[PDB]
Amino acid sequence: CTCVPPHPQTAFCNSDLVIRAKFVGTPEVNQTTLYQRYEIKMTKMYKGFQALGDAADIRFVYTPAMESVCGYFHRSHNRSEEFLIAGKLQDGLLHITTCSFVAPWNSLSLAQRRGFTKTYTVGCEE
């Protein structure tokens, strides 16, 4: 599972939901899910509008709870730390993996900060 950061063209466009957020909840691990969930202070959505049923259709992240899977090892207790999330939806719930484009906005380019805010949903092609 542990792959290398995949082209944002691919991550932006291939993914069916991308948004910047803060983590403000703990991961719920069912014994009989195969997946888990994390809660997050969703700041703004970049990709998902068509899924933006109401306004906020992405406030938790659903990854598989497997061993060889790429869930989402989240190491951040800061509820004021923003983030970047590339991920498609599953019957409603968001899905992500450590081999999906997912990292600190704050680590992004100012241009690719705008790009994701305006430019990478139609011109995702990094």
Side-chain angles (χ1 to χ4, degrees):
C1 114
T2 64
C3 100
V4 51
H7 308 326
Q9 125 97 91
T10 287
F12 207 121
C13 276
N14 229 89
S15 232
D16 278 72
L17 264 112
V18 197
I19 63 291
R20 88 150 224 214
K22 266 163 264 115
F23 277 81
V24 270
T26 188
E28 77 145 62
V29 198
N30 211 61
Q31 312 283 268
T32 278
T33 151
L34 261 172
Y35 33 103
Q36 297 150 239
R37 300 95 175 63
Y38 262 110
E39 314 193 298
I40 57 254
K41 251 307 94 140
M42 187 268 306
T43 23
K44 46 197 99 290
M45 62 281 301
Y46 303 58
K47 216 216 121 124
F49 300 103
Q50 56 220 115
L52 257 72
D54 247 86
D57 71 284
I58 323 121
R59 4 207 183 74
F60 316 86
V61 324
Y62 304 52
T63 138
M66 236 203 210
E67 200 74 297
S68 53
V69 76
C70 248
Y72 193 84
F73 270 101
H74 159 240
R75 319 308 260 161
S76 288
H77 58 308
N78 209 246
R79 53 188 62 242
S80 261
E81 211 289 284
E82 286 129 78
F83 266 99
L84 190 283
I85 299 159
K88 170 180 129 153
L89 267 190
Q90 207 109 287
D91 280 72
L93 310 315
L94 178 65
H95 280 234
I96 61 292
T97 47
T98 110
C99 180
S100 193
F101 197 121
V102 196
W105 191 240
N106 280 315
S107 198
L108 266 56
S109 323
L110 36 244
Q112 180 164 293
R113 274 210 206 193
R114 78 82 192 282
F116 274 91
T117 208
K118 122 177 148 181
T119 354
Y120 287 42
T121 122
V122 198
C124 62
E125 34 198 305
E126 51 110 75

